[PDB]
Amino acid sequence: DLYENPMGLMGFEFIEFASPTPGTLEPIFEIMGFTKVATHRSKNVHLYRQGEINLILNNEPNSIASYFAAEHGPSVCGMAFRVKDSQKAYNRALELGAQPIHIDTGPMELNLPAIKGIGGAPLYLIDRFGEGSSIYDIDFVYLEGVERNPVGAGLKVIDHLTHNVYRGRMVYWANFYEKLFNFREARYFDITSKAMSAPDGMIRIPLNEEGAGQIEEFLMQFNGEGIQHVAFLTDDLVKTWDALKKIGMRFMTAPPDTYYEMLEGRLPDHGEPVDQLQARGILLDGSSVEGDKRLLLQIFSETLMGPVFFEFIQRKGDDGFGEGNFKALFESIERDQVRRG
Amino acid sequence: DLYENPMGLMGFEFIEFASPTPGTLEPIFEIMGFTKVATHRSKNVHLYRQGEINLILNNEPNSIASYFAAEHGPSVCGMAFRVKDSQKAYNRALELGAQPIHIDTGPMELNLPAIKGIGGAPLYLIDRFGEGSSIYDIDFVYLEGVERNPVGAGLKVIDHLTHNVYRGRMVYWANFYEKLFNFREATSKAMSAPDGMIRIPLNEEGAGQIEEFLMQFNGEGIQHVAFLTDDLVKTWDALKKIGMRFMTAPPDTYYEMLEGRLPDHGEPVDQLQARGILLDGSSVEGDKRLLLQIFSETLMGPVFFEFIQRKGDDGFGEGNFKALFESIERDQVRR
Amino acid sequence: DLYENPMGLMGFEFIEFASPTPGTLEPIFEIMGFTKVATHRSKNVHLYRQGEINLILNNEPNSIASYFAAEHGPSVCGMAFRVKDSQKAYNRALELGAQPIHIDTGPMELNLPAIKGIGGAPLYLIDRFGEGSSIYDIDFVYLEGVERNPVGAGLKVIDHLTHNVYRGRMVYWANFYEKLFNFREARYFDITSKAMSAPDGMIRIPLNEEGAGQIEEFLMQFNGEGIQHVAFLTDDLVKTWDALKKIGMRFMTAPPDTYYEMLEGRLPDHGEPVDQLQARGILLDGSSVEGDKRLLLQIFSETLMGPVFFEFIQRKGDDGFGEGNFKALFESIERDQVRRG
Amino acid sequence: DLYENPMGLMGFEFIEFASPTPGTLEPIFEIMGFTKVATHRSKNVHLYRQGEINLILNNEPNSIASYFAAEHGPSVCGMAFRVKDSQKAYNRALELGAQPIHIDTGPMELNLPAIKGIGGAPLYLIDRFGEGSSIYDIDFVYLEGVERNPVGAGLKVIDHLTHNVYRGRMVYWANFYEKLFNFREATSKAMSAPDGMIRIPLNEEGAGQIEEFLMQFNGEGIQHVAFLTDDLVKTWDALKKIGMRFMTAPPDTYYEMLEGRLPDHGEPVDQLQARGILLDGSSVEGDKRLLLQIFSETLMGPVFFEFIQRKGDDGFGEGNFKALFESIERDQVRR
Ligand SMILES: Cc1ccccc1-n1c(=O)c2c(C)c(C(=O)C3=C(O)CCCC3=O)ccc2n(C)c1=O
Ligand SMILES: Cc1ccccc1-n1c(=O)c2c(C)c(C(=O)C3=C(O)CCCC3=O)ccc2n(C)c1=O
Ligand SMILES: Cc1ccccc1-n1c(=O)c2c(C)c(C(=O)C3=C(O)CCCC3=O)ccc2n(C)c1=O
Ligand SMILES: Cc1ccccc1-n1c(=O)c2c(C)c(C(=O)C3=C(O)CCCC3=O)ccc2n(C)c1=O
Ligand SMILES: [Co+2]
Ligand SMILES: [Co+2]
Ligand SMILES: [Co+2]
Ligand SMILES: [Co+2]
């Protein structure tokens, strides 16, 4: 409860996926250790689960997600927050100037309220959850025999979703979340990024601005502003790595060996087993001041759904996002190209 | 079981009430042995229960039930059938020509399908039922601590409810329940459903007690709801104990004629006659298909309730009409 | 401007017709001297006209009129009032408890507001009218060459539409028009009828209650409350009669010859040419007190659309509805059966 | 005439403006020579006219135009094509995959069809036009007495309007106007319509003046609207007389290069250079396809307007880009 929470937020509830071409999102869920676990009572949409992360696969045609997918490709096409009271939130959001998104509801099914968010993605406000009570219990039908609490590679919750937005728009969306939900900028990065945290301490949505770089090509390939990477939290990254590598997950190529030598200059006495991080390509960041250890282990997938990739992170006291790895990696590729030509 | 169930009916699920005067519907559920059990998550609507009977009290203003109540006063303003697949039924009713009634659904609540039925009241088609999965477990907040399976005076299910329609419209409403739900007829018309549990009898007709209902009710509508019980003498002493008002007893001449009209019925005539309970049925080939029944006052405008116990008779107490008539002649003559 | 007119009423605008079977309403319009004069830009609905009476033929399938026609047969299925400001009226009606009826509007076409009236018939509130401005100019397309102000047999305006309602409901609908439009009961008849006039002096809607009579059979055959007869006004009834008889109009059988002899006892010095009324079956009513002549000539068609019939009336100072003709006709059939057996 | 017109386009019908600050849009229509002529029958929306150009000022709150204006400031927030059959076009656009924008229509008003076009602004499809039968004769109340055909500074039609889109989205919007309306391309892309009158050029591109527009505008949108006139020197003295602010003149070196770049153009170079007017075209085979043009300041955020006169050139003044660039070098060197 970090500051005033007028919308009654209580963390991420679920993320929605859709693609214009079929069979492109199912196999990606598999390699990240997610399991299909239920199917909608009426619609052609499906629930994948791992730890406490719910992921919805929307394959409904002429639906709001398939239009979003028709324009952006394979994508994160929806995003739901947990709220205490979702009509108090939905009303307050429309009073403060949000535009509704009508999600068509079938008979005997739950009217899910959304507003227009990033890229035109619906932002749902959900006030039912918990076993037996959840919207998965009400509106979904679980697979016979299958388990409803799969643990997979050990991913626990969504840590954050970071958006890429067009030059200028970072301040626009930053006011969107500040005005309607009372988000606050907790961090700033100048390499350009604003780290918007929710008053619940769980919902983190970083926003990124570029020219001629990694962000500008994302907006070209995504055909608009959208979620660049989804970050899953894990209790142990190296074990999640093995369990993820066991099931065909592909990661970005490890940094040069130089990167792992410089670790004891960068973060003296971090305590991490460098052999184990070097054997997997895992990165590390944080700061080490006066006996207080704040660190962060993270590794990225390659791009998997169009220009969207994923992050697997374990936090050891650092509430940042790996920002130091950008300078750390350039000095690494630098010393390693120097050492060879 | 009887025959084919193209809409998958599985009994009555709930009936709904509305009134344009407050504090008039609650006292009537109470002396009928119903207990407030749950309150809607957001609207001013309430769940009263006894046995497996579900009574929704709708006090939501500017709504479907209030506009209905403003025209017809205290009424049964909605009726819900239970169904296997509510979506296939909804579209089937519509493609066969039914009209939809849209019921305004709040955020995070259940979108309830209904067509327009008798007198304009919504006919809901509900496919969520049973403990933990019904529409009350979802959209209603049970009074915390309160026993949520109250049994009360021992009323079990909604046996039937009947409709008073204007002259000529018996056929119109029989068709409506024939075309859409495959009801079969088994002046009155006893329309029974393919699931063996949903019975809707349709009455017409002048200057009599149906003419009086359609005046006092301001249109077609449900005239009485009948709740079944297993021991009507037992249900009677319970229902009396809490304040029920019955229509007053026949003249004792009605009881002199019992073993003449229903030879060897076997009922404790004294225990019945002490409570004004009616009898009806037939005794043929030693098979004594019989039934007990009593009614109440008009309690919601011209609407009242019947409390029946079925000892093998599939009827509704019809012969009680001629049977009472002769009890008033043989009492007038001896008066 | 007879009393306070909060809804800003200015007479009848149009009457709407629909039948479950085709070719049953077109030939009836003909014999009453109405002319097809336009067709809707998009919908399969048509304008018939004569003097200032507009009549709409709605043949649109799955429309609100075809559902009303599916239940009541050939019928008057809609009714529109002229108003000064139709959103002030439509708002006020919904504040005072009327239920809206949504009439589906096509693109580039006019949203017509209605509320639920008698039988579930929509009551439209129209604030555009007058040549060039009317809804017929906006939403309708006139037939090439054809005239747009046909005069026919000389029928001028709708004088009144009288409804039949179930026993008891006369007071209900009387409060409907009193509450929402400030109608007042101007006459009462005990034979049972309430004569509801509008605060503009033009809109007249009598309501009729029955048992075992002319009204009870109407509700049986109409399958509900509805308009029993539509009354057209004419400047000269006997000339309208000839012009109507010229085009195949069929009337109710004339009263006995007895009826026309008793006329000078009933209404001394009425001045009407009795030969001309007797030659046509036209009826007469009014009262004759102290040099003031208030009279009323009228004749009825047979039933033409199911149980619905029509009235052609000419008013000479009597603001009634022919009520005296009910007693006048029984005493007529009485003397005439006496004079023969 | 050019080629087949599957949506039956027949020119621009109106453009719509909205701003989230009051009293900022009206002064700009006035110095541009537009006159308030009509006011909506019920909403706070207004019709400004000059020539055959129709400008709708939408000040309706809690509406489609205000939400658009709150995001992008003073803007062109809607654009209407004129069409033979608006219903067949509407359904055709939808069956080809366009999305609908619903515009909330009051009682007794016209239900205006629109799809979602550039930047999210409605693209209306209007089939009522001309005097006595247009949407202004119906839904708008003309100021009584006011001359309803004002001619002003002699601007006639909307020549074109252009869109600034983000990098890569030129193709996206070309397809959108190719698939739905059969526009043909005839960094920029000049999309022209099958009716020979509707031209929408699409621009992208960094750190330049398009990057600056999509920042200052907060998305894709119309960057300038161009109104055609028959005598641009005449339109200039009129437009100046009433307060127009132009982008200031080229350096005189731009005029030393005219008869070098456009041999024997024949234009009164002194009358142009006194007004900062630009020239462009080609002279080949004695056919001198040429055009005159001037722009204004940014007047609605980063949006401005162009006033062109076409002497046989079908272009947009493109060569003026290189032509000015060389006028700033040859002026910097001599400075
Ligand atoms: C994955 C990748 C591919 C090709 C070029 C570069 C990368 N790449 C990243 O994208 C990357 C990101 C995206 C983060 C990161 O999560 C992040 C936040 O969530 C919010 C604030 C801004 C930010 O940097 C951290 C380290 C990263 N590092 C070290 C890396 O190399
Ligand atoms: C007539 C009357 C007046 C004042 C209160 C009560 C009564 N009244 C009834 O309403 C009454 C009813 C309503 C039934 C009955 O339930 C029944 C059905 O359920 C459907 C078929 C037709 C029918 O009548 C049976 C006997 C009745 N009897 C015997 C009686 O006296
Ligand atoms: C036409 C008809 C057929 C078979 C039985 C009778 C008739 N019949 C009528 O229906 C009839 C009517 C309907 C009126 C009449 O217009 C009317 C009003 O508009 C409102 C108040 C009640 C009323 O009577 C007047 C005279 C009538 N007369 C004289 C007649 O014979
Ligand atoms: C660059 C600039 C800065 C500050 C104000 C004005 C300008 N500016 C323009 O905006 C400008 C435009 C906008 C056009 C033009 O209308 C045109 C089209 O209509 C579509 C094809 C691409 C294109 O450019 C032509 C010449 C122009 N010129 C010469 C100029 O200077
Ligand atoms: Co991250
Ligand atoms: Co009964
Ligand atoms: Co009449
Ligand atoms: Co231009």
Whether D114 and D176 share a structural domain? no
Query: How far is Cα A330 from Cα A255, in angstroms, rounded to an integer?
Result: 10
In this structure, which amino acid lies at residue D187?
Answer: T
Whether C338 and C191 share a structural domain? yes
Q: What angle do CA D204, D100, D42 make, to 5 degrees?
A: 105
CA A237 to chain centre: 16
Whether C178 and C257 share a structural domain? yes
Whether C81 and C190 share a structural domain? no
Q: How many CB atoms lie within 10 A of CB B284?
A: 8
Q: Can you list the positions of beta strands (E) in chain B?
A: 9-18, 35-40, 45-50, 53-58, 75-83, 114-116, 122-126, 140-142, 155-164, 184-185, 188-192, 199-203, 221-229, 278-284, 287-295, 304-311
Identify the bridge partners of residue A151 per DSSP, sorted by sequence position: none
For ligand 2, atom 9, the nearest C-alpha belongs to B295
Query: How far is Cα C181 from Cα D188, in angstroms, rounded to an integer?
Result: 61
- Experimental approach was X-ray
Q: Is D273 helix (H, G, I), strand (E, B) or coil?
A: helix
Q: Enumerate neighbours of B (3 or more CB pairs within 8 A).
A: A, C
DSSP A202-245: --EEEEE----SHHHHHHHHHTSSEEEEEEEEES-HHHHHHHHH
Residues 6 or more apart whose CB falls under 8 angstroms from that of B18 comprise B25, B57, B58, B59, B65, B66, B68, B69, B74, B75, B77
For the record, the structure tokens of D267 come out as 């234009």
Query: How far is Cα C240 from Cα C237, in angstroms, rounded to an integer?
Result: 5
Contact D83, D129 (CB under 8 A): no
Q: Is A175 helix (H, G, I), strand (E, B) or coil?
A: helix
B100 CB neighbours in chain A (<8 A) are none
Distance from CA of B167 to the nearest CA of C (A): 6
In this structure, the dihedral spanned by the alpha carbons of residues A20, A24, A28 and A29, taken in order and rounded to 10 degrees, is 60
In this structure, which amino acid lies at residue B204?
Answer: E
Query: How far is Cα A341 from Cα A334, in angstroms, rounded to an integer?
Result: 10
Whether C210 and C62 share a structural domain? no
For the record, the structure tokens of B203 come out as 């009455």
DSSP B276-329: T-EEEEEEETTEEEEEEEEEB---BTTBEEEEEEEEB--S-STTHHHHHHHHHH
- Short-list D70, B149, B2, CA closest to A98: D70
Distance from CA of B109 to the nearest CA of A (A): 5
B215 CB neighbours in chain C (<8 A) are 167-168
- Short-list B7, B308, B25, CA closest to B158: B308
Query: How far is Cα C207 from Cα A336, in angstroms, rounded to an integer?
Result: 98
Please report the resolution in angstroms. Answer: 2.7
Whether B183 and B305 share a structural domain? yes
Answer with the one of B107, B129, B152 that is the final residue of a domain.
B152
Contact C31, C249 (CB under 8 A): yes
Whole-angstrom CA distances from D286 to D255, D256, D262, D315, D328 are 22, 22, 12, 18, 30
Whole-angstrom CA distances from A316 to A235, B294, D304 are 10, 74, 54
Residue A287 CA to ligand 5 centre (angstroms): 17
User: With an 8 Å Cβ cutoff, are B90 and A107 in contact?
Assistant: yes
Distance from CA of D135 to the nearest CA of C (A): 9
Query: How far is Cα D82 from Cα D90, in angstroms, rounded to an integer?
Result: 12
Contact D195, D181 (CB under 8 A): no
Query: How far is Cα D138 from Cα D131, in angstroms, rounded to an integer?
Result: 10
In this structure, which amino acid lies at residue C102?
Answer: H
Query: How far is Cα D180 from Cα D8, in angstroms, rounded to an integer?
Result: 11
- Short-list A107, A108, A123, CA closest to A64: A123
**Nearest neighbour of C111 by CB, restricted to D90, D109, D128:** D109
- Backbone dihedral angles phi then psi of residue D166, each to the nearest 5 degrees: -70, 170
Domain that holds residue C95: 1-152
Whole-angstrom CA distances from A239 to A153, C293, D65 are 8, 108, 54
Whole-angstrom CA distances from C165 to B220, C225, C228 are 13, 5, 9
**Nearest neighbour of B206 by CB, restricted to C67, C211, C220:** C211
Contact D292, D232 (CB under 8 A): yes
Pocket of ligand 1 (CB under 6 A): A 160, 162, 189, 193, 195, 206, 208, 214, 229, 252, 283, 300, 311, 321-323, 325-326, 329
Burial A71-89 (b: 16+ CB within 10 A, else e): bbbbbbbbbbbbbebbbbb
Residue B173 CA to ligand 7 centre (angstroms): 32
Identify the bridge partners of residue D280 per DSSP, sorted by sequence position: D291
Burial class (CB in 10 A: 0-12, 13-18, 19+), D277: buried
Residues 6 or more apart whose CB falls under 8 angstroms from that of C196 comprise C174, C177, C178, C183, C184, C185, C186, C204, C205, C206, C207
The secondary structure of residue D120, as a DSSP letter, is: G
Q: What angle do CA D170, D173, D174 make, to 5 degrees?
A: 80
Whether B185 and B47 share a structural domain? no
CA B228 to chain centre: 9
Answer with the one of A89, A119, A152 that is the final residue of a domain.
A152
Q: Can you list the positions of beta strands (E) in D204-335?
A: 221-229, 278-284, 287-295, 304-311
How big, in percent rounded to 5, are the helix, strand and coil portions of chain B? Answer: 25, 35, 40
List the end-to-end C-alpha distance of chain B, in Å, as a whole number: 51
User: With an 8 Å Cβ cutoff, are D67 and A219 in contact?
Assistant: no
Query: How far is Cα D43 from Cα A230, in angstroms, rounded to an integer?
Result: 45
Q: Enumerate neighbours of D (3 or more CB pairs within 8 A).
A: A, C
Whether A66 and A209 share a structural domain? no
For ligand 1, atom 4, the nearest C-alpha belongs to A214
- Backbone dihedral angles phi then psi of residue A264, each to the nearest 5 degrees: -85, -15
Q: How many CB atoms lie within 10 A of CB C285?
A: 21
Residue B243 CA to ligand 2 centre (angstroms): 21
Dihedral over Cα of D192, D195, D196, D199: its sign: negative
Identify the bridge partners of residue A320 per DSSP, sorted by sequence position: none
Distance from CA of B133 to the nearest CA of A (A): 8
Chains A, C in contact: 3+ Cβ pairs under 8 A?
A: no
Whether A279 and A254 share a structural domain? yes
User: With an 8 Å Cβ cutoff, are B86 and A105 in contact?
Assistant: no
Query: How far is Cα B37 from Cα C263, in angstroms, rounded to an integer?
Result: 73
Whole-angstrom CA distances from C285 to C154, C159, C176 are 21, 16, 30
Whether C53 and C116 share a structural domain? yes
B109 CB neighbours in chain A (<8 A) are 110-111
Q: Is residue C81 within 6 Å of ligand 3 at its C-beta?
A: no
Query: How far is Cα A247 from Cα A242, in angstroms, rounded to an integer?
Result: 9
What is the residue whose two structure tokens read 């403006």?
Answer: D17
Contact A226, A163 (CB under 8 A): yes
Query: How far is Cα A126 from Cα A123, in angstroms, rounded to an integer?
Result: 10
Longest dimension (CA), chain D: 67
Residues 6 or more apart whose CB falls under 8 angstroms from that of B144 comprise none
Identify the bridge partners of residue D184 per DSSP, sorted by sequence position: D192
Contact A117, A125 (CB under 8 A): no
Residues 6 or more apart whose CB falls under 8 angstroms from that of B50 comprise B32, B33, B34, B35, B150, B151, B152, B153, B155, B227
For the record, the structure tokens of C37 come out as 């004069």
Q: Is C92 helix (H, G, I), strand (E, B) or coil?
A: helix
- Which residue in C has a C-alpha nearest to residue D83's C-alpha? C108
**Nearest neighbour of C108 by CB, restricted to D107, D110, D132:** D110
Whether A174 and A293 share a structural domain? yes
Q: Is C169 helix (H, G, I), strand (E, B) or coil?
A: coil
**Nearest neighbour of D168 by CB, restricted to A211, A212, A220:** A220
Whole-angstrom CA distances from C307 to B333, C162, C276 are 48, 13, 29
For the record, the structure tokens of B97 come out as 């020509």
DSSP C23-80: TSSHHHHHHTT-EEEEEESSSSEEEEEETTEEEEEE--TTSHHHHHHHHHSSEEEEEE
Query: How far is Cα B77 from Cα B63, in angstroms, rounded to an integer?
Result: 12
| Per-residue three-class SS string for A17-83 | EECCCCCCCHHHHHHCCCEEEEEECCCCEEEEEECCEEEEEECCCCCHHHHHHHHHCCEEEEEEEEE
User: With an 8 Å Cβ cutoff, are C128 and D105 in contact?
Assistant: no
Q: Is D189 helix (H, G, I), strand (E, B) or coil?
A: strand
Q: What angle do CA B21, B23, B29 make, to 5 degrees?
A: 115
**What residues flank ion ligand 8 with Cβ within 5 A?**
D 226, 306, 316
Looking at the 3D structure of chain D, how many domains does it have? Answer: 2
Which helix (H) or strand (E) segment holds residue A12: the answer is strand A9-18
Answer with the one of C133, C152, C171 that is the final residue of a domain.
C152
DSSP C115-158: EE-GGG-EEEEE---STTTSHHHHHEEEPSS--SS--TT-EEEE
Whether B166 and B188 share a structural domain? yes
**Nearest neighbour of A167 by CB, restricted to D67, D169, D211:** D211
Contact B266, B298 (CB under 8 A): no
Query: How far is Cα A48 from Cα A35, in angstroms, rounded to an integer?
Result: 5
Q: What angle do CA D48, D50, D51 make, to 5 degrees?
A: 140
Which helix (H) or strand (E) segment holds residue C217: the answer is helix C214-222
List the end-to-end C-alpha distance of chain A, in Å, as a whole number: 53
Distance from CA of D120 to the nearest CA of A (A): 10
- Backbone dihedral angles phi then psi of residue C333, each to the nearest 5 degrees: -60, -25
Identify the bridge partners of residue D125 per DSSP, sorted by sequence position: D81
